Design a protein around this ligand. Structure first.
Ligand SMILES: [Bi+3]
Ligand SMILES: [Cl-]
Ligand code: NA
Ligand code: NA
Lengths: 106, 106, 106
């Protein structure tokens, strides 16, 4: 895959979380999002393909994926506590972050 | 924000945690600390401005913020479980680590 | 402590987790594992000693610690919740990750 496909996986699992019926489904979707966010952190997005891997721009990109990963980590804790609705609330902020990253790096 | 301002945010919120009366205040302060540590990962302390962004020294700096982030996450999980006093002890350890990073890079 | 020392610490604490009977023992071993993994993340492993610090190889090396750390903390949250055997299974997965990293970069 690639960065774009990782972003598509993030969006798909956000859609799954929105429609989820139980904590197991939210946990599964958030786990998939965690894996996808890491994989995207290892990629180079289209806008930064003219920048070096250790440029400040790419370092900041990887930190942005760290931010997304921490939002996922905390939402996953909230889901493992069984609070499905609050985990969906946190997934809303997840959606905001993912959209901003898509607009910034595509 | 620059590195010093992020460290100041960390210390202000440590003070907030020290004097908190409920889990909500602790959680708010810890969320602010997480945001500040992540933002500081994108900064450069003044004495490392001549180093390359991926130099061993800058790697040590960013990973120090990773250390802080996992300690913040511990305190946040404790707060989520209602364990305010354990979260405050964890925040005392966090204050020690923030001080050590400050002394190391200033 | 160099990278190899950190790997040996991770392996030792995995052995500790395997034979633990209570959650406090598991939590202690996992805390030590987090410390060792974050120490290793800032290192240059033996196989990559001839590579630039800005090389994509070192970036991938560091990003590979994201998985290790989030698996450590999956196990640690399970241990904080008192699920000893579940934490031990999570630590088995973590052991897979640790040994793969060790043998990849030595
Ligand atoms: Bi937790
Ligand atoms: Cl880097
Ligand atoms: Na609980
Ligand atoms: Na027994």
């Amino acid at each position: 895959a690639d960065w774009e496909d990782n972003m598509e996986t993030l969006n798909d699992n956000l859609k799954v979380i929105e429609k989820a019926d139980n904590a197991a489904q939210v946990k599964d979707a958030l786990t998939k999002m965690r894996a996808a966010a890491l994989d995207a952190k290892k990629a180079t997005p289209p806008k930064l393909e003219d920048k070096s891997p250790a440029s400040p721009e790419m370092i900041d990109f990887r930190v942005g994926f760290d931010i997304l990963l921490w939002q996922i980590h905390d939402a996953l804790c909230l889901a493992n506590e069984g609070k499905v609705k609050e985990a969906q609330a946190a997934a809303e902020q997840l959606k905001t972050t993912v959209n901003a990253h898509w607009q910034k790096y595509r």
